[PDB]
Design a protein around this ligand. Structure first.
Ligand SMILES: [Ca+2]
Ligand code: NA
Ligand code: NA
Ligand code: NA
Length: 274
């Protein structure tokens, strides 16, 4: 039997899936620790590794495979079910086995996705500072029509301090924070002016190596919900620009409280894909 993780109905991805829109032929690049391509619940169609010693289609860490399953776990009678179970999934490995990478590796991965005509870049990764090269890579990706999504940060709140990480903090990238199954903000979720939308992040069950399924918490889990949502909107309205898809996710989000903690609120892809 296929389990349906709470986040799938919470953002109403199931309502769009039932209309027949599943992200078919939408190309989504997951820039992460790789993907376990041989997982029975995942089809990885290509990608590239900017990490020395590791091929793009294995995942020693598990993080990239979990993030991939949330975008796109196959709709079948096993495992889990992704937000957009028909997307073309590309594994762009920019993070090693231990879950970290150079800004150079990341930049190379963004450029690879841009060069290769990805429709959506998902970055479930973050740093305290980012760089000039990274900025330009996300800007060029966005200007070229890619929807670029990143995890806001797992730094929580602390008085009035801005805790959004990079690349989420750049204007051209959707900073996604994290709610739980009760639609409440998870306490680890970063806060600040740049926070854009919320998606499910605490207690997220997805694909995990080897050939199994696991629960993780983090804005890393929330980001792919939004990446998938982007794919679903594209599959229903194929001519929308990256900026229109982004404005639809934003402007139709369910308000939850102060934008400092929630941005515009919880994505609702049914409302966004209308
Ligand atoms: Ca499945
Ligand atoms: Na597979
Ligand atoms: Na941003
Ligand atoms: Na655009």
């Amino acid at each position: 039997a296929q389990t349906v993780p709470y986040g799938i109905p919470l953002i109403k991805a199931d309502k769009v899936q039932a209309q027949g829109f599943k992200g078919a032929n939408v190309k989504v690049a997951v820039l992460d620790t790789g993907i376990q391509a041989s997982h029975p619940d995942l089809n990885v169609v290509g990608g590239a590794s900017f990490v020395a010693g590791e091929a793009y289609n294995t995942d020693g860490n598990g993080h990239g495979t979990h993030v991939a399953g949330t975008v796109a776990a196959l709709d079948n009678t096993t495992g889990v079910l992704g937000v957009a179970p028909s997307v073309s999934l590309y594994a762009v490995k920019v993070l090693n086995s231990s879950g970290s990478g150079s800004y150079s590796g990341i930049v190379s991965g963004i450029e690879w996705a841009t060069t290769n005509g990805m429709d959506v870049i998902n970055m479930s990764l973050g740093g305290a500072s980012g760089s000039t090269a990274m900025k330009q890579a996300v800007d060029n990706a966005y200007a070229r029509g890619v929807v670029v999504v990143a995890a806001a940060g797992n730094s929580g709140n602390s008085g009035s301090t801005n805790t959004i990480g990079y690349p989420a903090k750049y204007d051209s990238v959707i900073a996604v924070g994290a709610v739980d199954s009760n639609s409440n903000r998870a306490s680890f979720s970063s806060v600040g002016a740049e926070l854009e939308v919320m998606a499910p992040g605490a207690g997220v069950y997805s694909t995990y190596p080897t050939n199994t399924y696991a629960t993780l918490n983090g804005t890393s889990m929330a980001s792919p919900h939004v990446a998938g949502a982007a794919a679903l909107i594209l599959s229903k309205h194929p001519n929308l620009s990256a900026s229109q898809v982004r404005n639809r996710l934003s402007s139709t989000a369910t308000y939850l409280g102060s934008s400092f903690y929630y941005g515009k609120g919880l994505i609702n892809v049914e409302a966004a894909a209308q």
